[PDB]
């Protein structure tokens, strides 16, 4: 919905010009290419016209034209970028690199004749000389190490596991020893009712006591092992490493064999039902499957490159006070030595001209980037292929995990 949308029905030539100053180092970047909004496709080539580049190319991708994002028909009344055309919009960004410097960018995106032009002024400040940016220690890509659904599922299963472990601990400490607990559980079906809390298997899973002193500090109630195991799986799940994956796999196998043991006790040798126990068994199985999937991906991701997601969501909300939009998102650059460099992106966009612009509901853009080189180009350069598509707004529940209200919580 605008005149501006009608300007993106075919292939549009793209020109990008950037002047930058990072810790005193001045540089110029000129890129050219074409964009296809119907496919949300960007094909661009950038060159550094002032010699070598002082910052890694991946740190400049977000700075170096969201008006080429593919907006589905249903969401077309939420496309601010195209509605501001041909007059264009001003896009300002502050990008905070964790434990490092900061980018301040101001750009004008507008139509000049037939060409969509994006002129950028950038300045970086407070960057470490031996950091990941000025040290050129970032990988030449914008991939996502672990798939997003595995991260979300992992943090959810681990959080629920910690909560159930804490509640089981609370029942063991403040509920299980009262006689009214026994009397009430023999007449009522409650999630707090179980015969394993005040039992032989309540401490150390029954074994590992009389294997240790049976009064030692290593023979704790099972809920303690719960908190420790789920918090451990959470904190080590944050790290993507072969070591971490092996450790998580081993701990998950221990968790599933322990769950089979205590389940066997639950059904046969201590005949009862424990909802908390069964739920934690399901969570241990899910963590097992997630760790196995992380190892399989670690070994076969090179084959599955052709089908990796590698999508980053930029979250857009309306800004009525300035007749524009605001956007926030985080980019996780992979470091060569295995670590991660975080980039916090704060963004605002205001229309240049005086015309009806579309103020959208909260949504997001899914952006996939592919960085490559031109073997014929002798200058410091970057070949970029982008795929951007808007998402976050539907009516049906079958795709509800895709809604913006749920995606914002996991970023």
Curated annotation (Swiss-Prot):
Record annotation: effect of changing residue 66 to L: In RSGFP4; increases fluorescence and shifts the major exitation peak to 489-490 nm
Function, in words: Energy-transfer acceptor. Its role is to transduce the blue chemiluminescence of the protein aequorin into green fluorescent light by energy transfer. Fluoresces in vivo upon receiving energy from the Ca(2+)-activated photoprotein aequorin.
Keywords from the UniProt entry: Chromophore, Luminescence, Photoprotein
Outcome (variant: residue 76 to R): In Topaz; shifts the major emission and exitation peak up to 20 nm
Quaternary structure and interacting proteins, as annotated: Monomer.
Expression sites (tissue/organ): Photocytes.
GO biological process: bioluminescence; generation of precursor metabolites and energy
Reported impact of residue 65 to L: In EYFP; leads to yellow fluorescence, folds faster and more efficiently at 37 degrees Celsius and has superior solubility and brightness
Effect of residue 388 to R: In Azurite; shifts the excitation and emission spectra to shorter wavelengths and increases quantum yields compared to BFP
Phenotype when changing residue 331 to T: In P11; increases fluorescence at 475 nm excitation and at warmer temperatures such as 37 degrees Celsius. In Esmerald; leads to brighter fluorescence. In VisGreen; leads to brighter fluorescence
Protein name: Green fluorescent protein
Higher taxonomy: Eukaryota, Metazoa, Cnidaria, Hydrozoa, Hydroidolina
Result after altering residue 367 to Y: Gives rise to yellow-emission variants. In EYFP; leads to yellow fluorescence, folds faster and more efficiently at 37 degrees Celsius and has superior solubility and brightness
Alphabetized InterPro entries for the sequence: GFP, GFP-related, Green_fluorescent_prot
Entry's family note: Belongs to the GFP family.
Outcome recorded upon mutating residue 386 to G: Suppresses the 399 nm excitation peak, leaving only the longer wavelength peak at 475 nm
Taxonomy, superkingdom: Eukaryota
A Pfam family this chain is assigned to: GFP
Use of this protein: Green fluorescent protein has been engineered to produce a vast number of variously colored mutants, fusion proteins, and biosensors. Further generation of mutants led to more stable proteins (at 37 degrees Celsius for example) with brighter fluorescence and longer fluorescence lifetimes.
PTMs per UniProt: Contains a chromophore consisting of modified amino acid residues. Maturation of the chromophore requires nothing other than molecular oxygen.
